[PDB]
């Protein structure tokens, strides 16, 4: 399962 | 906004027979950026053939394979055409049985 | 001994050509079970190995939902990168992500992965230690100063040791037939001419799985590497994996050389000569 959140730059 | 030039490997899936069946590989690696146009080419005309999933090894440069079946010819001339940002002309890499 | 789960984004920002474009691969192991790309129709994460079709299609909705949000912050992350390096629309940018965990026979988390770079350069890569960054410029030193703010470290951490290693035990028996399986490399020697007095013996190593192998030559029980030409590992085109190692020899002396291949689809490292 790929990650539901990524913390923007 | 480093960049690296495509490394190409035409070659055959099996050890190449006269009048037998084969798969045809272009296989380009360590190319950035991810922009590229890879064609397989009988005697200089285009080939149908399927192209792999973008995706790149650990130092960030990418690899991409395009491949379709072929039957190796006495007659038949095949090529594999790069073009890509970073070749000031597409380069085009024979394909030889032997490797 | 290990098995890898690892997915690998790609960005890249498109100028005037319409919105950037964002691709998504899965792999396990060496092997590809999933893809995504924002340019292609369909609008879905799709298999990309037999053993994925065992899923539903609640797990391929939430698999496409997923990844379609993360091509928003991605398309967003894509801005800031040109505000923080002072670039223009003009040109076309690249960001990468690779993530994902190592396991080991027990099925615990034995290494976990987080890292992130722009235009084929590192940006920002999550320690091992899993609770600090390692960023690369001052431009990725921003995000690094916002991310601890945030606690993004604690976020990763809990995927990686939770989350990657679940599915990585889930994937590995919907593939076990075939994961778990070791393909031994078909190995021939070949003999090419260059002069008068020297010709090239050429070590091949066919159709194996996992890509890992090692291809020496040595002559007379000793390696010489400084003599070899060795080609990357490629792919055959049907999953599996193909090398060669090359050395010039005298045209006059074949048999006193021999070829000496590694794999762990192997029981015995077997060696080769020219016949």
């Known amino acids: 399962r790929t990650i539901s959140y990524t913390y923007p730059f | 906004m480093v960049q690296h030039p495509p490394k190409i490997q035409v070659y055959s899936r099996h050890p190449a027979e006269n009048g037998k069946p084969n798969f045809l590989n272009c296989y380009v690696s360590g190319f950035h950026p991810p922009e590229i146009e890879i064609d397989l080419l009988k005697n200089g005309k285009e080939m149908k053939a399927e192209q792999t999933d973008l995706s790149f090894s650990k130092d960030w440069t990418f690899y991409l394979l395009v491949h379709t079946e072929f039957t190796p010819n006495e007659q038949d001339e095949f090529s594999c055409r790069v073009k890509h940002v970073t070749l000031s002309e597409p380069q085009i890499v024979k394909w030889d049985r032997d490797n | ?275």
Not at chain 3, 163 to 179: A, N
Not at chain 3, 248 to 263: A, L
Request: hydrophobic letters at 30%; a negative charge; glycine letters at 8%.
């Open chain 3, 1 to 275: 001994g290990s098995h890898s789960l690892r997915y690998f984004y790609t960005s890249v920002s498109r100028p005037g050509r319409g919105d950037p474009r964002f691709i998504a691969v899965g792999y396990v192991d060496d092997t590809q079970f999933v893809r995504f790309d924002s340019d292609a129709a369909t609008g879905r994460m799709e298999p990309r190995a037999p053993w994925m079709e065992q899923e539903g299609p609640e797990y391929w909705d939430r698999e496409t939902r997923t990844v379609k949000e993360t091509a928003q912050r991605y398309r967003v992350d894509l801005d800031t990168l040109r505000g923080y390096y002072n670039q223009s629309e003009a040109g076309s940018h690249t960001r990468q992500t690779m993530y994902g965990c190592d396991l080991g026979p027990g099925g615990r988390l034995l290494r976990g992965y987080s890292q992130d770079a722009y235009d084929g350069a590192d940006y920002i890569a999550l320690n091992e230690d899993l609770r600090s960054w390692t960023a690369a410029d001052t431009a990725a030193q921003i995000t690094r100063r916002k991310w601890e703010a945030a606690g993004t470290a604690e976020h990763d951490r809990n995927y990686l040791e939770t989350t990657c290693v679940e599915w990585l035990r889930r994937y590995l028996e919907m593939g076990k037939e075939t994961l778990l399986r070791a393909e031994p490399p078909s190995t021939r020697v070949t003999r090419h001419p260059i002069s008068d007095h020297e010709v090239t013996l050429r070590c091949w190593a066919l159709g194996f799985y996992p890509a890992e192998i090692t291809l020496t030559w040595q002559r007379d029980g000793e390696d010489q590497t400084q003599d070899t030409e060795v080609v990357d590992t490629r792919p055959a085109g049907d999953g599996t994996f193909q090398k060669w190692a090359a050395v010039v020899v005298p045209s006059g002396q074949e048999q006193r050389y021999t070829c000496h291949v590694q794999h762990e689809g192997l029981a015995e490292p077997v060696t080769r000569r020219w016949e």
